[PDB]
Protein backbone atom coordinates (compact mmCIF):
# COMPACT_ATOMS: atom_id res chain seq x y z
CA UNK A 1 0.00 0.00 0.00
CA UNK A 2 1.34 3.43 -1.06
CA UNK A 3 0.93 5.04 2.47
CA UNK A 4 2.92 2.19 4.07
CA UNK A 5 6.01 4.41 4.56
CA UNK A 6 4.09 6.82 6.77
CA UNK A 7 1.95 4.16 8.41
CA UNK A 8 4.96 2.01 9.25
CA UNK A 9 6.97 4.94 10.69
CA UNK A 10 4.04 6.19 12.80
CA UNK A 11 3.58 2.73 14.31
CA UNK A 12 7.37 2.42 15.02
CA UNK A 13 7.70 5.90 16.57
CA UNK A 14 4.56 5.59 18.68
CA UNK A 15 5.95 2.41 20.27
CA UNK A 16 9.55 3.67 20.52
CA UNK A 17 8.61 6.96 22.21
CA UNK A 18 5.83 5.62 24.42
CA UNK A 19 2.85 7.43 22.91
CA UNK A 20 -0.78 6.45 22.95
CA UNK A 21 -2.68 7.88 19.93
CA UNK A 22 -6.22 9.09 20.60
CA UNK A 23 -8.42 10.06 17.63
CA UNK A 24 -11.86 11.57 17.23
CA UNK A 25 -14.45 9.88 14.97
CA UNK A 26 -14.21 12.73 12.41
CA UNK A 27 -10.49 12.11 11.64
CA UNK A 28 -9.66 10.79 8.17
CA UNK A 29 -9.91 6.98 7.85
CA UNK A 30 -6.13 6.69 7.49
CA UNK A 31 -5.63 8.30 10.91
CA UNK A 32 -8.45 6.36 12.57
CA UNK A 33 -6.71 3.19 11.31
CA UNK A 34 -3.40 4.04 13.06
CA UNK A 35 -4.94 5.24 16.33
CA UNK A 36 -4.96 3.19 19.56
CA UNK A 37 -8.39 4.50 20.54
CA UNK A 38 -11.04 6.18 18.34
CA UNK A 39 -14.22 7.72 19.67
CA UNK A 40 -16.49 10.64 20.33
CA UNK A 41 -15.84 13.59 22.66
CA UNK A 42 -17.33 11.82 25.67
CA UNK A 43 -15.47 8.56 25.04
CA UNK A 44 -12.21 10.51 24.54
CA UNK A 45 -12.83 12.44 27.79
CA UNK A 46 -13.49 9.19 29.62
CA UNK A 47 -10.35 7.58 28.22
CA UNK A 48 -8.40 10.70 29.30
CA UNK A 49 -9.57 10.23 32.93
CA UNK A 50 -7.92 6.80 33.23
CA UNK A 51 -4.86 7.26 31.02
CA UNK A 52 -1.55 5.61 32.01
CA UNK A 53 0.91 6.41 29.11
CA UNK A 54 3.29 9.31 29.68
CA UNK A 55 2.82 10.80 26.21
CA UNK A 56 -0.37 11.32 24.18
CA UNK A 57 -0.79 12.15 20.53
CA UNK A 58 -4.23 13.67 20.14
CA UNK A 59 -6.03 13.73 16.69
CA UNK A 60 -9.03 16.07 16.65
CA UNK A 61 -9.54 19.75 17.54
CA UNK A 62 -7.83 21.95 20.10
CA UNK A 63 -10.55 22.15 22.76
CA UNK A 64 -10.56 18.38 23.16
CA UNK A 65 -6.72 18.24 23.10
CA UNK A 66 -6.83 20.85 25.91
CA UNK A 67 -9.41 18.83 27.85
CA UNK A 68 -7.05 15.82 27.64
CA UNK A 69 -4.19 17.98 28.95
CA UNK A 70 -6.39 19.43 31.73
CA UNK A 71 -7.10 15.87 32.94
CA UNK A 72 -3.42 14.88 32.55
CA UNK A 73 -1.51 18.06 33.47
CA UNK A 74 1.81 16.23 33.99
CA UNK A 75 1.79 14.18 30.74
CA UNK A 76 2.98 15.47 27.35
CA UNK A 77 0.05 16.00 24.95
CA UNK A 78 0.86 16.80 21.31
CA UNK A 79 -1.22 17.66 18.24
CA UNK A 80 -0.12 17.62 14.52
CA UNK A 81 -1.80 20.96 13.66
CA UNK A 82 -2.18 23.55 16.38
CA UNK A 83 -4.74 25.49 14.27
CA UNK A 84 -7.29 22.61 14.28
CA UNK A 85 -10.18 24.20 16.14
CA UNK A 86 -13.97 24.45 16.43
CA UNK A 87 -15.12 27.84 15.03
CA UNK A 88 -18.48 27.49 16.84
CA UNK A 89 -16.73 27.42 20.20
CA UNK A 90 -14.57 30.39 19.47
CA UNK A 91 -17.60 32.73 19.34
CA UNK A 92 -18.49 32.21 23.02
CA UNK A 93 -16.45 34.46 25.34
CA UNK A 94 -15.95 35.08 29.10
CA UNK A 95 -17.70 38.43 28.69
CA UNK A 96 -20.88 36.91 27.22
CA UNK A 97 -20.93 34.30 30.01
CA UNK A 98 -20.55 36.99 32.69
CA UNK A 99 -23.30 39.06 30.97
CA UNK A 100 -25.63 36.06 31.08
CA UNK A 101 -24.94 35.12 34.75
CA UNK A 102 -25.62 38.75 35.75
CA UNK A 103 -28.75 38.68 33.66
CA UNK A 104 -29.93 35.22 34.87
CA UNK A 105 -28.71 35.06 38.51
CA UNK A 106 -29.26 31.45 39.60
CA UNK A 107 -28.93 29.68 36.22
CA UNK A 108 -25.98 27.31 36.09
CA UNK A 109 -23.69 27.64 33.08
CA UNK A 110 -23.49 24.36 31.21
CA UNK A 111 -20.91 24.32 28.47
CA UNK A 112 -20.49 21.95 25.57
CA UNK A 113 -16.99 20.42 25.32
CA UNK A 114 -16.28 22.50 22.20
CA UNK A 115 -15.67 25.62 24.20
CA UNK A 116 -12.44 27.44 24.96
CA UNK A 117 -10.58 26.27 28.07
CA UNK A 118 -10.88 29.83 29.45
CA UNK A 119 -14.67 29.57 29.07
CA UNK A 120 -14.51 26.24 30.85
CA UNK A 121 -12.93 28.03 33.89
CA UNK A 122 -16.23 29.97 34.09
CA UNK A 123 -18.58 26.98 33.63
CA UNK A 124 -20.48 25.12 36.30
CA UNK A 125 -20.42 21.95 34.30
CA UNK A 126 -19.25 20.60 30.96
CA UNK A 127 -21.29 18.23 28.78
CA UNK A 128 -21.26 16.37 25.49
CA UNK A 129 -24.24 15.43 23.22
CA UNK A 130 -24.76 12.01 24.89
CA UNK A 131 -24.85 13.29 28.48
CA UNK A 132 -26.31 16.81 28.18
CA UNK A 133 -29.88 15.72 29.07
CA UNK A 134 -28.79 13.65 32.12
CA UNK A 135 -26.41 16.36 33.34
CA UNK A 136 -28.94 19.17 33.02
CA UNK A 137 -31.62 17.07 34.74
CA UNK A 138 -29.28 16.50 37.73
CA UNK A 139 -28.76 20.19 38.26
CA UNK A 140 -31.07 21.73 40.81
CA UNK A 141 -32.36 24.49 38.54
CA UNK A 142 -35.21 24.64 36.00
CA UNK A 143 -33.33 27.27 33.99
CA UNK A 144 -29.78 26.81 32.59
CA UNK A 145 -27.40 28.88 30.48
CA UNK A 146 -26.03 26.68 27.66
CA UNK A 147 -23.58 27.14 24.87
CA UNK A 148 -22.14 27.42 22.39
CA UNK A 149 -24.49 25.15 20.39
CA UNK A 150 -28.11 26.35 20.09
CA UNK A 151 -29.44 23.11 18.58
CA UNK A 152 -28.10 20.91 21.38
CA UNK A 153 -29.36 23.47 23.91
CA UNK A 154 -32.81 23.43 22.31
CA UNK A 155 -32.72 19.59 22.24
CA UNK A 156 -31.89 19.60 25.98
CA UNK A 157 -34.94 21.87 26.62
CA UNK A 158 -37.24 19.48 24.77
CA UNK A 159 -35.93 16.45 26.68
CA UNK A 160 -35.78 18.00 30.17
CA UNK A 161 -38.68 20.44 30.10
CA UNK A 162 -36.23 22.98 31.54
CA UNK A 163 -35.70 26.46 30.17
CA UNK A 164 -32.47 26.65 28.23
CA UNK A 165 -30.93 29.98 27.41
CA UNK A 166 -28.49 29.56 24.52
CA UNK A 167 -25.31 31.55 24.06
CA UNK A 168 -23.90 33.01 21.92
CA UNK A 169 -26.54 34.22 19.46
CA UNK A 170 -27.00 31.55 16.75
CA UNK A 171 -24.12 29.38 17.94
CA UNK A 172 -24.20 26.27 15.73
CA UNK A 173 -22.11 23.68 13.93
CA UNK A 174 -22.25 24.44 10.11
CA UNK A 175 -21.44 20.78 9.44
CA UNK A 176 -24.73 19.45 10.86
CA UNK A 177 -26.96 21.98 9.03
CA UNK A 178 -28.62 19.24 6.91
CA UNK A 179 -31.97 20.02 5.24
CA UNK A 180 -34.94 17.83 6.21
CA UNK A 181 -35.86 17.20 2.56
CA UNK A 182 -32.75 14.94 2.48
CA UNK A 183 -34.62 12.64 4.88
CA UNK A 184 -37.82 12.80 2.75
CA UNK A 185 -35.68 11.81 -0.24
CA UNK A 186 -33.86 8.93 1.44
CA UNK A 187 -37.21 7.59 2.79
CA UNK A 188 -38.37 7.30 -0.88
CA UNK A 189 -35.08 5.70 -1.96
CA UNK A 190 -34.60 3.24 0.92
CA UNK A 191 -38.04 2.85 2.58
CA UNK A 192 -36.69 0.37 5.15
CA UNK A 193 -33.55 2.29 6.15
CA UNK A 194 -33.17 3.77 9.60
CA UNK A 195 -32.20 7.43 9.91
CA UNK A 196 -29.78 8.42 12.67
CA UNK A 197 -28.88 12.05 13.18
CA UNK A 198 -26.82 14.04 15.68
CA UNK A 199 -28.52 16.38 18.21
CA UNK A 200 -26.51 19.29 16.61
CA UNK A 201 -28.88 18.92 13.62
CA UNK A 202 -31.79 21.45 13.28
CA UNK A 203 -35.10 20.53 14.89
CA UNK A 204 -36.85 19.59 11.60
CA UNK A 205 -34.05 17.13 10.89
CA UNK A 206 -34.03 15.56 14.38
CA UNK A 207 -37.85 15.29 14.30
CA UNK A 208 -37.82 13.26 11.09
CA UNK A 209 -35.09 10.88 12.21
CA UNK A 210 -35.58 7.38 13.67
CA UNK A 211 -32.79 8.03 16.18
CA UNK A 212 -31.04 11.05 17.60
CA UNK A 213 -27.69 10.72 19.41
CA UNK A 214 -23.95 11.29 19.75
CA UNK A 215 -21.63 9.48 17.33
CA UNK A 216 -20.78 7.09 20.23
CA UNK A 217 -24.47 6.35 20.52
CA UNK A 218 -24.82 5.92 16.75
CA UNK A 219 -22.11 3.24 16.81
CA UNK A 220 -24.15 1.23 19.31
CA UNK A 221 -27.51 1.40 17.48
CA UNK A 222 -26.73 -1.48 15.07
CA UNK A 223 -26.09 -3.73 18.14
CA UNK A 224 -29.85 -3.57 18.83
CA UNK A 225 -31.42 -2.53 15.51
CA UNK A 226 -31.16 -5.19 12.79
CA UNK A 227 -31.71 -2.79 9.81
CA UNK A 228 -29.63 -3.56 6.71
CA UNK A 229 -29.28 0.14 5.87
CA UNK A 230 -28.54 3.17 8.08
CA UNK A 231 -28.62 6.75 6.99
CA UNK A 232 -26.21 8.91 8.96
CA UNK A 233 -26.69 12.58 9.71
CA UNK A 234 -23.22 13.59 10.93
CA UNK A 235 -19.71 14.33 9.69
CA UNK A 236 -18.45 12.03 6.95
CA UNK A 237 -15.67 10.45 9.10
CA UNK A 238 -18.32 8.53 11.00
CA UNK A 239 -19.16 6.44 7.92
CA UNK A 240 -15.72 4.84 7.96
CA UNK A 241 -16.01 4.09 11.71
CA UNK A 242 -19.45 2.52 11.31
CA UNK A 243 -18.61 0.46 8.22
CA UNK A 244 -15.51 -0.91 10.05
CA UNK A 245 -17.58 -1.89 13.12
CA UNK A 246 -20.46 -3.35 11.04
CA UNK A 247 -19.16 -4.63 7.69
CA UNK A 248 -22.50 -6.47 7.25
CA UNK A 249 -24.63 -3.27 6.99
CA UNK A 250 -24.80 -0.34 4.57
CA UNK A 251 -24.04 3.18 5.88
CA UNK A 252 -25.28 6.05 3.72
CA UNK A 253 -24.52 9.68 4.42
CA UNK A 254 -27.62 11.87 4.82
CA UNK A 255 -25.62 14.46 2.91
CA UNK A 256 -21.83 14.81 2.36
CA UNK A 257 -20.65 16.93 5.34
CA UNK A 258 -17.01 17.69 6.10
CA UNK A 259 -15.45 19.50 9.07
CA UNK A 260 -12.45 21.32 7.55
CA UNK A 261 -10.79 21.59 10.96
CA UNK A 262 -11.06 17.83 11.59
CA UNK A 263 -9.45 17.27 8.19
CA UNK A 264 -6.37 19.36 9.06
CA UNK A 265 -4.68 16.28 10.45
CA UNK A 266 -2.98 14.11 7.89
CA UNK A 267 -0.75 11.10 7.72
CA UNK A 268 2.11 13.41 6.82
CA UNK A 269 1.78 15.95 9.66
CA UNK A 270 0.98 13.16 12.15
CA UNK A 271 4.26 11.57 11.18
CA UNK A 272 5.98 14.94 11.61
CA UNK A 273 4.34 15.25 15.00
CA UNK A 274 5.87 11.95 16.21
CA UNK A 275 9.28 12.73 14.65
CA UNK A 276 9.54 16.14 16.27
CA UNK A 277 7.31 15.43 19.35
CA UNK A 278 5.42 18.69 18.59
CA UNK A 279 3.12 20.60 19.02
CA UNK A 280 2.83 20.29 22.79
CA UNK A 281 -0.46 21.47 24.36
CA UNK A 282 0.64 23.94 27.08
CA UNK A 283 -1.89 25.63 29.37
CA UNK A 284 -1.43 28.07 32.28
CA UNK A 285 -1.50 26.27 35.68
CA UNK A 286 -4.41 28.48 36.74
CA UNK A 287 -6.49 27.45 33.75
CA UNK A 288 -5.87 23.75 34.41
CA UNK A 289 -6.78 24.18 38.09
CA UNK A 290 -10.06 25.99 37.34
CA UNK A 291 -11.29 24.23 34.19
CA UNK A 292 -10.82 20.76 35.69
CA UNK A 293 -13.74 21.33 38.04
CA UNK A 294 -16.67 21.52 35.62
CA UNK A 295 -14.97 18.67 33.65
CA UNK A 296 -14.76 16.30 36.64
CA UNK A 297 -18.26 17.36 37.67
CA UNK A 298 -19.62 16.10 34.29
CA UNK A 299 -18.53 12.56 35.20
CA UNK A 300 -19.84 13.02 38.78
CA UNK A 301 -23.29 13.91 37.36
CA UNK A 302 -23.43 10.81 35.15
CA UNK A 303 -22.26 8.15 37.62
O1 LIG B 1 -17.77 14.21 19.33
C1 LIG B 1 -18.45 15.26 19.37
O2 LIG B 1 -18.81 15.82 20.44
C2 LIG B 1 -18.92 16.03 18.16
C3 LIG B 1 -20.17 15.79 17.67
C4 LIG B 1 -20.61 16.53 16.59
C5 LIG B 1 -19.82 17.55 16.03
N1 LIG B 1 -18.58 17.87 16.45
C6 LIG B 1 -18.14 17.13 17.50
C7 LIG B 1 -16.80 17.51 17.94
O3 LIG B 1 -16.29 16.99 18.95
O4 LIG B 1 -16.30 18.37 17.21
S1 LIG C 1 -17.95 19.03 13.41
FE1 LIG C 1 -18.87 21.04 14.05
S2 LIG C 1 -18.90 21.06 16.31
FE2 LIG C 1 -17.43 19.32 15.68
S3 LIG C 1 -15.32 20.51 15.48
FE3 LIG C 1 -16.24 20.65 13.41
S4 LIG C 1 -17.35 22.74 13.38
FE4 LIG C 1 -16.92 22.11 15.62
CL1 LIG D 1 -18.57 7.72 29.89
CL1 LIG E 1 -20.70 13.02 19.33
Curated annotation (Swiss-Prot):
Notes on activation and inhibition: Inhibited by 4,5 dithiohydroxyphthalic acid (DTHPA) analogs, which bind to the catalytic iron site of the [4Fe-4S] cluster.
Purpose: Catalyzes the condensation of iminoaspartate with dihydroxyacetone phosphate to form quinolinate.
Source species of the chain: Thermotoga maritima (strain ATCC 43589 / DSM 3109 / JCM 10099 / NBRC 100826 / MSB8)
Keywords: 4Fe-4S, Cytoplasm, Iron, Iron-sulfur, Metal-binding, Pyridine nucleotide biosynthesis, Transferase
Binding site for [4Fe-4S] cluster: 86, 173, 259
Keyword Signal: no
Homology family: Belongs to the quinolinate synthase family. Type 2 subfamily.
Protein name: Quinolinate synthase
Pathway: Cofactor biosynthesis; NAD(+) biosynthesis; quinolinate from iminoaspartate: step 1/1
Pfam families xref list: NadA
Catalytic activity: iminosuccinate + dihydroxyacetone phosphate = quinolinate + phosphate + 2 H2O + H(+)
EC number per UniProt: 2.5.1.72
NCBIfam families for the chain: nadA, PRK09375.1-2
Residue sites binding iminosuccinate per the record: 24, 41, 112-114, 129, 198-200, 215
Keyword Metal-binding among record annotations: yes
BP GO annotations: 'de novo' NAD biosynthetic process from L-aspartate
Listed result of changing residue 112 to F: Loss of activity
GO cellular component terms, A-Z: cytosol
SUPFAM superfamilies listed in its UniProt record: NadA-like
Subcellular localization: Cytoplasm
Free-text cofactor note: Binds 1 [4Fe-4S] cluster per subunit.
UniProt GO MF annotations: 4 iron, 4 sulfur cluster binding; metal ion binding; quinolinate synthetase A activity
Names of required cofactors: [4Fe-4S] cluster
